[PDB]
Every structure is written in structure tokens, then in C-alpha cells.
Amino acid sequence: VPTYQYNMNFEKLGKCIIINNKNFDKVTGMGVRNGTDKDAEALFKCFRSLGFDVIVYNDCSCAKMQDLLKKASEEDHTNAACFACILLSHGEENVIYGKDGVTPIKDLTAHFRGDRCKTLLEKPKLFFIQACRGTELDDGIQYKIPVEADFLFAYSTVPGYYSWRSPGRGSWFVQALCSILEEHGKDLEIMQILTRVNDRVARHFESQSDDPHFHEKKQIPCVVSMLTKELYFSQ
């Protein structure tokens, strides 16, 4: 009263995992996510600027993704300030597509509970998810600590909705997120950043297909926070 920031005084800001799924198996019938490569390239340079050690894995299967995050939580994070994961794929509420079929997000993040990844205790664990969480469209108008503590989920959309994307400019959430980080990534606290992000995708974007049933639609991101302190990317 006051109270404040997460300790950022470490050799490393932290590791960042970017899973970019563009092509899926015929079995699933899901379409190619053209423009996601443009999203991933943008995310790559931004999180690098912040100070993350970015790594991009392409078209992963459910096992790959599961195993990929499992090992991450097994690495030693003592010299890291935080951890970040960016998921780029098709998805359905509570789920993200892999090249295979489908995987519950809960299991991806689960590996970081405070009792399953001790080098990350009392440290922020960030997950940015760019995926659908349903198919609806927004049509328009006018001491001891909780193993579940210190997580942050920045979903590109609200539960049950579709997540928009430009084949040329990339997905809406990503495009907007990278713009705010580029201008304030090292100036505002996470919630301020993710808030300005919500404002852009909400005001500065509006769909536009020839088919009428998807015209002039809108989208609003969903930020889910279990963070216990303010987070800045600049000691």
C-alpha cells in the first residue's frame, strides 16, 4: 500500500516459445493459416527486443507441443525473470490445434504450476494465444504460494468467438500486440499494454469479405491474469 513489481534483475529476461502452425494434416480438414508466418516473424522481433530468447517451432503435432512445453518447464529458470509462450494456430474454446488434431490448453500450461516448475516460482509465466475459441462472430453496434498463481493468458479473443486474420497483414490480435510493444514494450506495465491492445483490435479493425455473412464483423481480446505484481520489461 503501495506494493509493486516482479523482480527483473536476472541475467536473462527469460525464454520465449513461439509455436507457429500453418499447415495441418488432411485428416483435420482445417485450412492453411496464410499470414501466420507474418505474425510469427513480427512476434519474433518484438519479444527479442524485449529481451526474450525466442525460438520458433513450426507445424507441431499435439505430442510435439506437449513435449516441447514439458521440457521447457524442466529447464533451469533460476537465472530467468520470467517465461513466455506464444501459440499461433486454429483452436476451439479450451483447445488449440496441432498438426495432428487437438490439444487442451490446460495441459500445455499445466507444466508450469509452481509445484511442477520450481525455478519459476513467484515469477510471471506468460501465454499469448492466437487461436479461435469457437466460431461465433461479433456483429456490431452503434509462507507458501498457490501453485496456480502468477500466470497470465493473453487470448486473441473472448470465449466462443472466432479470431480474425489478414492473409497479408496477419491476425488482428498479433498485428495490434506487436504495434503496442514496438512503441511501449519497455514503458508500460503488462496490463496497460494488453489494455491498449484490446482497444486497437476493438476500434481499429473490422472484417471485410465479399460474403455478407462475415462482413464488417468485430473482435475483442481476453486477458486473463493471475499475476500478483506489476510487470515491466525493464529493470
Partner 1 sequence: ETHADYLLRTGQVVDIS
Catalytic annotation, residues: 90, 132
Single residue of 19, 20, 35, 52 touching partner 1 by CB under 8 A: 35
Helices 36-50 and 172-184 pack at an angle, to 10 degrees, of 20
Work out whether 124 is an interface residue with partner 1 (CB under 8 A). no
209 sits near partner 1 (criterion: CB under 8 A) = yes
Instruction: Note whether 159 binds partner 1 by CB under 8 A.
Output: no
133 binds partner 1 (CB under 8 A): no
Out of 33, 99, 133, 218, which residue is the one contacting partner 1 (CB under 8 A)?
Answer: 33
Q: Which residue, chain included where needed, has cell 481499429?
A: 204
C-beta of 58: minimal distance to partner 1 in Å?
A: 17
Minimum separation from the CB atom of position 108 to partner 1 (A): 19
Measured from the CB atom, is 172 or 233 closer to partner 1?
Answer: 172
| Shortest Cβ 222–partner 1 spacing (Å) | 18
Q: How far is the CB of 131 from partner 1 (least distance, A)?
A: 9
- Residues touching partner 1, count (CB under 8 A): 25
Residue 223 bridge partners (DSSP): 154
Residues 71-100 that bind partner 1 (CB under 8 A): 90
Tell me which stretch binds partner 1 (CB under 8 A): 2-10, 23-31, 118-126, 182-190.
Answer: 23-31
Q: Which residues pair with 161 in a beta bridge?
A: 136
Long-range contacts at 44-49 (CB < 8 A, ≥ 24 apart): 44/18, 46/177, 46/178, 46/181, 46/182, 46/185, 47/16, 47/18, 47/84, 47/86, 47/181, 49/181, 49/182, 49/185, 49/186
- Measured CA to CA, the distance from residue 186 to residue 233 in angstroms comes to 6
Judged by CB under 8 A, the residue of 44, 47, 162, 233 near partner 1 is: 162
Selected from 63, 167, 183, 224, the binder of partner 1 by CB under 8 A is 167
Which residues lie near partner 1 (CB under 8 A)?
29-31, 33-35, 90, 132, 135, 162, 164-167, 169, 172, 205-211, 213-214
